[model samples]
Structure formats: C-alpha cells, structure tokens
Target: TVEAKNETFAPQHPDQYLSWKATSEQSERVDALAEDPRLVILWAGYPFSRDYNKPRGHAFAVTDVRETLRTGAPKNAEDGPLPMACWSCKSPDVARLIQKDGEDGYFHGKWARGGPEIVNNLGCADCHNTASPEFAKGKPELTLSRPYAARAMEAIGKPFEKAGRFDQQSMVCGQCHVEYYFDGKNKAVKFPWDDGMKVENMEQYYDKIAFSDWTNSLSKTPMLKAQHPEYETWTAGIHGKNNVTCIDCHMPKVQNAEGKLYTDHKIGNPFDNFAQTCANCHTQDKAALQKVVAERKQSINDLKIKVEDQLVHAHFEAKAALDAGATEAEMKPIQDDIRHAQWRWDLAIASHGIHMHAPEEGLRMLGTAMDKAADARTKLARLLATKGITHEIQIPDISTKEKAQQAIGLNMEQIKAEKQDFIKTVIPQWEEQARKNGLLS
Candidate 1:
C-alpha cells in the first residue's frame, strides 16, 4: 500500500546519467502541492501540521511548499502563519531573503500570509543565475553553487549539494526530499552526517534532543517518528555501500541512432529496467537477481506482520498499565519505547529499493527492527505484570486502517470530516490563486 510509484523505460548505457541536476522548473510544481489538506493533521502539533505535500517535480518545489500549511500560511509573522526558519527547503529565495532580512526575520512568519514580496515558489532564479559571468552563464545552479552549498555546510556540517565522488545525476534530487531535520540550534535542515547513517545513529541524534514527534494517543508517551529516511537506510544497505545511484535503476540510458545517449527519465523501479540496472552489477542472470529481490522483500513483509502483532500486544499492555493506575511519568518510557521501535521499523521499510537494491541489508534492518519491537512488547508486559496485573490485556482489532484508528482511540469520523472540509474549502482556493499567478497553470 505504501509502495512508491515506479515507471519503466527502455535500457541504455549508464554513462548518460552523469549530468542529471535538479532544475528549478521541477521544483515549481512540487511547491504548489504543499497545500494538501491531509498534511495539516498528520503533522499537527508540529510546524508541518500546517502544510506538507508529496514532492512533485523540481518545477513545483518551492512554490508548492511556500503556500502550503507547514510554513504557517499567514500574511506575516505577527499574524502567526509560520516562522521564517520554515523556508529552509522551499526555495533558494531563502538564501537571498535570509541574507537581506537576517535569519530571525526570515524565520518569523506564516507561509502565504507573508508579504506579497516574499512569495516566489521554486523557480529558475532559485537554482541559477541566468546572468552570471561564469561558465555556462545562463545554466542552472549546479549543486556546488555558493548559496546552496554554504547553507548545507552551515546546517548539516556537510555539503548537501555535492555528491562528492558519487555520480551527480540523482544526487541532486536526493537532497531536499531525503530524510533530514532542522539543526538543534539554527533550525537549518540538518542531515545526521556524523557517527554514521543508520537507525542507531538517527535515534542517538533524536535522543540528544530527547526529541519526540508526538506523544502517543494511547500510551501518552513522548515518541519519535521517522520521516522518510530512505536514502540513509539505503546507505546501510548493499546497493548504497556498493554505490548504486537511483538513476542507475530508475532512469537508465537509451542510445539514439546518432550514438547520442540520454537517460530515460521515466523514474521507476530498477526491476523494470533490470537489463540495464541490475545486469550491469550482478553477474548473475536476470532471473536470479529477481529471485533474490523477491525473497528479501517477502522476508521483510513477514517480519513486519509479526511486529505488527507485537505492537498490538504493546498497546494493550500500555492500556493495562493505565488501568492499574501507573503514573504518567512511569508510563512515559514505555510509550517512548513503542515510538522508537516503530520509528526504526518505519525507517527501514520506507526506504525504497530495499529488496533489489540491498537484499542482505534489507533483511538485516527488518530483522533488527523486529527484535526491538519484540523487546518493547516484552518490557510493556513486564511493566504491567509488576503492577500486580494478572489478566491478559485485550488486543484491539486493527485489521484495517479504520479499525486501527479506532484501536488507537481516534475520533475518526470527526477527523475525517475536518480533513474533507479542508480539502474542499482550502485546497481549491490555493490552487485557483496559484493558477492565476502562473504558479501551477
């Protein structure tokens, strides 16, 4: 159900993918979709509750998000839309805005409610200097350009725009959409680069903040949530360690009659183009590689179901803890464990290309997550039993999303209605205005 969309294209040489850089045009469309109403509640209690959306192409990037909820749709900070710090990923307009207005000034207001002066979505100007005197004077901003690079260094303590020795093609797309967080101090988009990129390292970073995305509805514990950490987990897997790039699979090249080659930018599954993608790396035949990928994916699926059962156990035990009069303080850690365990599981599974991209690593991560999930349940059981509870806690039915929401005590009808209303009333207005201004039209 959570599968990422996968497209297919005919195969060609791999070298043609070398020049893929993020274009401002793609960011524009991505930016416009930021008004999606589903985001408001998903990220509620956080800045993102205001707005979030699926990143589309580079054309819609900045504009979509700038007008969306997360940035706090407001006329100005005084009106409470969002803080200027929200600009981190939306546009290069941030670099210039922060430079002229200063960080505090930029981080101060709601998104669209801000002055009309600040509303450019992702665009060519955000990624390039058409008038620059440098090489390819009108070319798009390379990842190594001063503004993006400097901000990346200041925030993540690493250069985000550069792929270093890695291929330049897909790396650019990986930047904004990849897993990341605002730094502890500056609210800059910070990639956890030090110590390593793995589940443990990410947890450690969150621990440092004692950070939790939200308190659990049932357990009432401060909990951390893993946003899409697909690339980070990929780094731990075989393909990443083996240096496979997204374009290597998703957008393999095709040759034309003139011997000119260009990447097929259809952007989908590596399996669909295995003749070019996996065949290049694995000496094994196509059937063999497919088998390996399938086996790994099945293993993960089985493990996930096992862990979901475990989660059902933990949730009930938490309720038992509550029934037995456990103090809020006492229940907090138990809830946190549930949060952390699930967070790890989510990070591992959400990473795209796990099965085919890194068979062994995918299994390893899911296995580790299962273990942690089991431990979380065991601890919850122990905590309940310690309070002299002799009866088994009842597990709520969570066979479907609706059942699961009820299990978690959500007022699904009310929330759903609110979500629908937002979709109807707010989204159309934003789209209309965006179209009128040529943001999406």
Candidate 2:
C-alpha cells in the first residue's frame, strides 16, 4: 500500500498506461525506499542498493530510475555505469539499442549514463505490434521487430511469435509484471524455465551461476537475494496449477451498455470485482470466498513474523562468528541458509495476491523458510559455542527502518540528499531537453 499510488489523469485511462508507466512507478517507489535500513542491511553489498521497487503502471519507468538513489546520479553520458541489462525491463528503447548494437553492447554501460537516453518507458512497442495483428491478437508475434519478445520465445521453447497460445493483452502485462533477471553470462532475460518454477529450481539456477547480490558486511559471506518470484510461486499454487491465468482475474470481461465487451484493466485486488473475477467460475457465495482470502492473508502475516525473527537472529549470529574470526569458507553455509530462507519468504510474499492466489502453497513455502532460518541460527549458536565465544551476540538496534539501514552501513542521509539535489538541479533540464525533442509536451 505504501508503494502504490495511482496518479489518475483525465484522458489517461489506467489500462492505456499499464505497459511501462505502471512498471516504472512501482520501481521508483521501491528504489527510493529500499535504502531503508531494513532492506539495506538485508541486501548489503548487493546492486539492490542500486535499485528496486514495487511494480506500477508503465509511465514512470524512465523517471523512476532517474530519481532513485540506487542508480547513483551520473554527471554525464560517458561516465562509469550500471550494466546495459538494467534497461531490459524499463522500455522498448532497450530492444532498439540491442538491435542496433547487440545484447552485449546494450548491457555494457552504467545505468545512470544510459537513463537519459532510454526514455521511451514501457509501452505498446515493448509487447504489442499492430504491424502483426495476429500477434496483436495474443499470438506470439515474433515477426515484429522486438528483441525482448524473441528472448522470451527462447525461454518458452517455442517460436512464440507465431504461437497462438500467448495472450496478447495479458502477455503485455507479463512483459514487465513477471519476475526475472538478466543471466549475466549470456545477458539473456532468463526465466529459469528448464527445471520449472518451483523454489528448488530457481535456487539451482542461482547456484549454477554462483550468483550473489552482495557480501554480507557483518558476516563477510556472499549471499543471494531473491528477486520477485511471484509468477513462479503462483504457478505452484492451486490457481496456477489449475491453470488460472492473471487475465482470468485481473482482466475479467466487462459488458458495457453499448453491448461491447472489454477487459477491465483496473488491475487492483480482484475483490474489487469479485463478481466478474470469481463468480464467473465459482458458484459459491461471495462472503465465503472473501473469508477464504482473509484466512490466507492472516496465515501469511503470522508466518512472516516468525520468519523475520529468525532472519534477525541469523544476521546477528553470523556477525558474531565473523567478529570471532570465522573463516570466510566457514561462513559460506550460513550465508547459503540465509539466502534460501529469505528466498522462500520472498517468493511467498513477492506477489501481492499470493495469499488468495494459492493459500496452501503460500503457507507451505513460508513454513519451509522458517525451518531453514531457524536451523541456520541454531547451527550458528553451536558453532560459536564450540569456538568458546561465550558472549551473547548482540542484535543491533534495528527497531525502525532507519535504524536497520544504519546498522547495515548504508548512508541513507547522504543518498537521499544527493537524490534531492539531482531532482532539483538536474531533472528539470532533462525534462526540458525531452520536451524540445518532442518526447514530452
């Protein structure tokens, strides 16, 4: 709720802005706030310090990164940068650049230097092409000149462009809404499809790459941070396993007075349109369904408290080991446990709609995560005792988000002040330049 802000504009239909604007706004909000101690500590040594956020409608894609402290404001175009892959989800500008240069070239620069140039934002060009009406009609339209789609096709193992099964409208949402990462080796938008979307498979993918988001500052252990894996978790849920696509709930058909049928794009909680979303298939009373959702939500919240407690303990224990001169190799297993536990918690809660999407799987994932985190701390306790390190590991004061950040060594005040300077002194110029180029009115 804190990250969501629907900035409604007249003649600006929410559905029309769904592609890039929504995605951008979400990322901006998250990236701005991710530096909060709670997150900075969790992601210390990760590029997340560079960027992250909840997904929003498409319009804010370019502007969001520009405003975030994570991407570090660049003084000019030719300076050091974030990987070119950073642009993959922001706009069609990425597809165009990749085509002109190649994936390797596109992913070569710092994010800050490239931000000013990658301004198209997510849009129809990112996923839809009127040139191929067949593809526009929800078939995979590979013939259209979109590199991102082609990469997705590679993941799906079919020539998706012509594949009739890909839903054009809903798939457009998937373009940015789904979870993914650029497998740095190939610079490919890898979806971890080979072994499927289970927790184990994704972990295996991260393991194979020896991918680490950062080294824990306190523990000095390399760790993996889970990106949003909601779609995959949904797949493991009853709705996904039973084949309920997002469109079934989020874009239910609404019949207008003019006898026209259109999918409602007010992509909020389905409870807002329960009749259209669930009643279409379910004959049960609405109250019963609402109760089901409430129960699942409560279950997840209860488990979250337990999971967070274990993580808090794990972080402290690892720090204690490091202070006692634990070998970096000795800390590796502890870090792995932390990574897997957090990933499980992340995958379960990453999707805002998970509790109702698949209540059973949601709880199950959290349960497993709790076990792993508790076990990690338990092992830390024994290992520390063996080393004759008898002092109680002090859990740093992380009572507030700000406190958590300081505990993790993030310079929040400096980053925030620097971002404010960029917004005040720099962004207006970028806007004026874009306006002169006819990019904005």
Candidate 3:
C-alpha cells in the first residue's frame, strides 16, 4: 500500500481520504480554448490550440489527460506528437518512473508508451514520503519527491537536502506547480530558475538557451509557452514574501463531526473555506475578504482582456507584413516584441493564484505586455505602409471559438472525431493493461 490507495488509508484517515474524494466527485469540465477564442490564435501552432481545459481538480488528472485532444488520437502505443514527459505533473507514476529510471529515461519514449503504466491520479505519494513508517501509523510528512525539482533547486545552490522546514513545505507544491519547459533534446521538464523567479529572469534564461515551444503559425514568431508559474508568482506576492506557506491557505485544517482536527485534503480554493483559510490570519469579515479578492481579480481581468485583443491584432498584423514583402530582417524585431509580450501575458494569466496572490505584479506584467504588443503593432504598421499597403488592416470574424479555430486553420470536426475514436478504441485497452499490471484496481 505504499502507493497509499485511498481505500487502504481511509480506515485510519477517513477525513483526509473523504475530502480528497470530494475533489474526485465533482465533475464539471470547461474547454478553455472554446471559452475564449483569442487563445486559439495565441497558441496557434501548439497543441493547446487544438484543445485546452480548465483544471478539473487533481483527482481527475489521469482521466482527463487521456481524454484531452491536446494529447492527440493515438491508434496504439508509440503514436503521438508529444512525449511522456508532460505527464510529470499529472500522475504519481511519473515520480515512480523517474525514481527508477531518472528523467532522461522516463521521458525517453513517446507519451503513448506511458498509457499502460499509469492508473493512479494525483494522490498521497506525489507529495509525501510514503516509505516512512510514520505514514503507516497514519501520520504522513511532506517531502520533495520529484527529481526534476531536486535538480532545479540544486542548480540555484538551494539544495533540498539543506532546505529548512518552511521552504521544503513550500517546495512540496512547487515541485510540480511552477512554470517549466521540456528540455529541447530530451523533452525533460525543467524549471528555468537559474536566473531567478521574475518573469523577465526566466525569459532571459530561455532567450539565452534559445528555447521556444513552437513557431507561431500566423505571426511566425518563435514563441515561449508558459505553464502556470504558481510557486514563483505566490513568492513574489505579498503573502509568499511574508513567508506564508501554500498549505496555510489552500489546505488549512478543519474539525470533523467528532471535533477532531485534520488538514482539509480537498486541496483547493481558499475562498471555499473562509474561516479556516483567510480568517485564520486576517481579522476581516468574510464579506470584506471576498470583496477584496473580487476587486483585485477583476482589475487584472479588465486590463488582461484589453491586452489580449491587442495581441490578437498584433499577430495578424505581423502576418500582413509578411504577405506584403517584408523580409525576416525587417520583421525580426517586431516578432521579438510579440514573443516577449505574449509570454508576459501568459505568465500573468496562467498562474491560478496570481490575480489574488500578486495582483500588483499581474497588473505590472500586463502593462508591460500591452506596451510590447502595441510596440510590435506600430512597427508592423509602419513596415506595411512602406510596402505601399497604407490602408488599415482588416481582421477576420473571430468573434466565436469556431471562427477563431478556422481562422487559425484548425478542423475541430476532424480533431474531435479522431479523439473520439481514440477513446473508444485505444483507451479502454490502456485501462485493461493498467489493471493487469496492478497499476489500477
């Protein structure tokens, strides 16, 4: 039971187990790309353009990944555009595989190869040291169990071996939650923190290494796709600077029916349990606390929407410049500006806690993103004018997600059909083999 299946652990720890099950029980799903068509253009060449979703909570990690079109429709193992490395954050089996084979080995093959090995979702072992006898005694201690995280922390001279309790506690979540990229040659997930945690710092790190996730299909810019920069964003915010841990807010302890206290393993929104989360520290009425978060988040959203509109226009403008006889030499600087602008924008919005965790920082990044995108557009407009195309450019009808996907040249009908065939034909087999291997019950 070292994998610590909920069924086994619930005997002694029903509160924690049942709280986690609550996460598993919820089943709302939202397609982010469809919700916002602008994202289709933003991530044109990447698979995220094909399909991206809001988090369905940690318990659905494995189930949802199998179902997302971003993974593509594999007819069998060894057939997909991505490697297994993306699963690093989605399954505990990734930690197990790396512990056995190291990062290079675990990410050494196609992502489809992993379908048979994974059965568990995000669970106890992802963040805890289950090998300790204390776990069997119904007391589990936090630990950094990921090797990529170990290497990342080691690179900065803050080795996990020497980390203090608070930092190690923060890192238990940071191990998977922060911004990272797969190494170009090996597809190994890596934190670009050699420079620092600032958005510009990581940008510089990727720029130095010449890392780009994809070539933007419309703008032709070399793009840096940002994962959620959770740990770093919180650390920059007021709370993380004050040394408040993520667990203090997101997983605060609560009393059960018998009045025995245990950490809430729902592992979710602080807003859901105001007393245990916010009121534990701030002495404000729940309504006041709620009001503050709503306004702060709204401010970011207001500015972010305007910035996204400008970025969409900037991409199309760059394409027009290309079509109008602009050379790579002429468009180079413009492309660079858009690349940086979009990255800053992604860093601002993608970090889930950023709106509240660091509202000021989010606004700062958004302002800079707006400036860069506008800069790119102006420069592109001037170039187009010199090419004798002086009229204002016309943007296509992308008011809807379907229209935007078509403008970006995606055939959603085909993509969904392929995914349906994959789920019907390939996925059940993966589940069967996983059970045969004892990876599932």
Candidate 4:
C-alpha cells in the first residue's frame, strides 16, 4: 500500500532520517598504514603519510576533512595547504558557496577560507536540484551539481543532459566518486578522462601532457596518485553493461515500517541487503554470494601486495642507482617504468571495489603493473652493473609503520604535533564562526 506521507521524502532534515550516521561501522582502508608501513614509505611527503583513517560515515565527512592533516590546520582563511576546491566533495554548502563566488572564484583560494561557510555535511542538495519544485515535492531527480563532473562527462562524449535515467543515477555518484586532480595552473579540479577511463588510456593522456601528482621522494620518478575511480571501473563491469546503476545495489529500495517503498539511502555493501539488491538477479544464498565476493577480493589483494613489495624495492634500487653516479639519461627509462607500473597498480586498488565491479579488468591492470615493475628492476640491475656496484642493494628494515616513515625521512611526532595543534585551536574557531553565520546549528 502506498503511504500518503513518506518520512524519507524530507531528506534535508536530520530528524527525517539519520542518514549521516548510518554507516559508522563499515570497514575502510585507512588502516593500511597500520597493517603495512610500506604505505608510509610510498606516500612519503604526502599528507596521507601523516594520517589516513578509513572513512566513518556521512556524518563525519566535515569532521574528517577538518581533522585530516592533508588540509593542514589553518588559523584563518588563506592559511591552509589545500585549495578551496577541496571542500567540493564534503558538503552541499559548496554549491551555494560556488554560486556566490563563481566556479573559478570558489576554487581560487585556500581551503580554510570556506571552512566557516561549508558547515553542512553531505546532503540532498549535493545529488539533486533541491530548489526545484519537483525535488521539494518528493519527486527527487538525479542531478550533477559539480561543474568538473559536468565538463568531464561532456569530454567523454556522455553529457549528463543526454544520459538515460539509470546512467544519470550512476553519474550523480560520479560527480565526486571518480578519479580527479587539481589543475596545476589554476588549482581547479579536473578529471583525466579525456582520452578514456581505461588505466593505460588515462596514463597516456597524463604522459602526453607531462602531468604528475608528485615525484616519488625515494625513486625520483614522477608519479600519479589514482583517486577513487569507482564510476570508471564499474562502467566497464557486467552490472554496468546491463544498466545496473549504483543506487540499484548500494541503495536498494525497501519497504519502511508503514509498508511504503523508499530507496534506502544508507549507501553501503549490497551484501547487507541482498534480498532487496542481489536477489533481483542472483538466486544464490547470501553465504554463497559472500564467498564469491571474498574470493575475488582476496585474489586481487594478493596481487596488490606483490606489486607493493616490488615497487618498494624498485624505489630503493632506483635510489641506489642515483647514489652510484647514474645520470638523468641513464635513469630515464627506469623512472618511466616505475611511473607506469605504480600508476597501474594504483588504478586497480584505488577503485572502491574493483574486484567485484570489474574483476577481469582489475586483474589485467595488476598483471601489467607486475610486468612493468619487473622491467624497472631489470633495467636498474643493468645500470648498477655498469657502475661496478653489482651486489644487491641494501635497504633499511621497514617492517613497521614507524620504521617505514623513518626510512622515508619523516618525523611522525612533528607531523602529528602540528596537526593536533591545528585541530584543537583552529577548528573550534571555524565551528564557532559557522554557527554564528547560521550555516551550522
């Protein structure tokens, strides 16, 4: 029976549905550093080296962004390392702020400048035209508010306006979930999908433009950091080919207490509600479906670990070659190998669920990463042999996170101290200002 009034319709009110705090217990990869310190070594100079915790819930998006060392502790506006563009994914207030500042102006300054204004966390306005009468009246349509995604879709010949209903649902998530980087010249966020979403295709586009996130502190090789590419990887999967949008699995429709069907907005593992999600297609029991997912994930994880070991070795080996008088010309090929290998590895793992989304595609990228890493080590061996340093390179013991950070020349204590000070002293001020401005209650 259709209910006359649905509580879920008023998503803008926290009292309607506590969606923000819905997924606090879900697992995340932020604990990677604790499990394998090699990540500390790999990230080295990046803020991710200082602190990375698995995300908690939508409730914590603003809190997490404020607390992360990546944003740095700003005493005031114009006082942080990241740009204002960083706030785009954390809040819907971003849309309002952008309206006031214009797209370029919104992205122009320091992250902290917008801290007081962007008080709300992820909400309805982010994925819907909240001001539209249709949305207010409970007929919420998928929408893309982020200009970067709008431009990216057009670049890839899939303009949002031209997309079908299901594709728009997927693209709505793509607005923030996909891989993107800040343009060097303007610090404007841009997606690197102009060439294509395939790992190698994106690499070629970046290589053609000589774009790199940063130089590997250990290897001196230019590197690319693949952010989450969920949409790209999912688009190439079976589910996507059949028009299964993100909402179909992650936010399956459910009957509430009143027997009214509403899309559950919790947004989490499909396995949690398989009867409503996977049962739409698969006949297998939940346990059986879980086993399939676990096996595929485990397979990808094993290959991911192997590639990590090889890349760590490659970094140290490259450093040794430099120490042994190798010229830029002699090391160029090796560096390129390192670049391509690591990028491929990152692309595979960076996607939220590559194993389930596109297992074959993920495995193929990992295989190529392994090949490139081997190629890099082989060239490094030849370079060392010419320099008369034929013996195996000696690397520091980095079995733990501390040792890894130490090997990479980072002072963990100092980094944490600065971050703690910023969080304690500066963040409260921002909160107060936000409350005063009526952006927060």
What overall lDDT goes with each candidate model? 0.53, 0.63, 0.84, 0.81
TM-score of each: 0.70, 0.82, 0.96, 0.94
Residue 31, model 2: Cα distance from true site in angstroms: 9.7
lDDT score, candidate 3, position 36:
83
**1 or 2, greater by lDDT:** 2
| Distance from true location, Cα of 333 in model 3, Å | 1.1
The numbered model that scores best in TM-score is 3
The alpha-carbon deviation from the true structure for residue 320 of candidate 3, after best TM-score superposition, in angstroms, is 0.9
Candidate 2 vs candidate 4: the TM-score winner is 4
Give per-residue CA lDDT, model 1, range 1-441, as digits (tens): 100001100022223222222233234333211322322222224443333344455435445554444443233235543444455555545545655666656555444443333434433333333234451322233342224334534454345544453544434544543556554443445565454566787788788777665665455656565565655655566666767766677667766467866555444456766787878777898788778777887887677556656665675677678878888777766766776776666566555455655556656666776776677677777778789876778765444444444444456466546545644565566557645754343
> Which residue pairs in candidate 3 collide?
none
lDDT of 2: 0.63
Residue range 236-293, candidate 2, lDDT tens digits: 6777666677778876777656765655544545677789889989999889999978
Model 2 CA RMSD to the hidden true structure, in angstroms: 5.5
Q: Where does candidate 4 clash, by residue pair?
A: 30-54
For residues 314-433, could you state the per-residue lDDT of candidate 3 as single tens digits? Answer: 999888998888999998999999999999999988875788889999999999889899889889889999999878778899888889988888898999998999889888898899
User: Lowest-scoring 10 consecutive residues by lDDT in candidate 1?
Assistant: 1-10
RMSD of each: 8.0, 5.5, 1.6, 3.7
The superposed Cα distance between candidate 4 and the true structure at residue 398, in angstroms, equals: 1.7
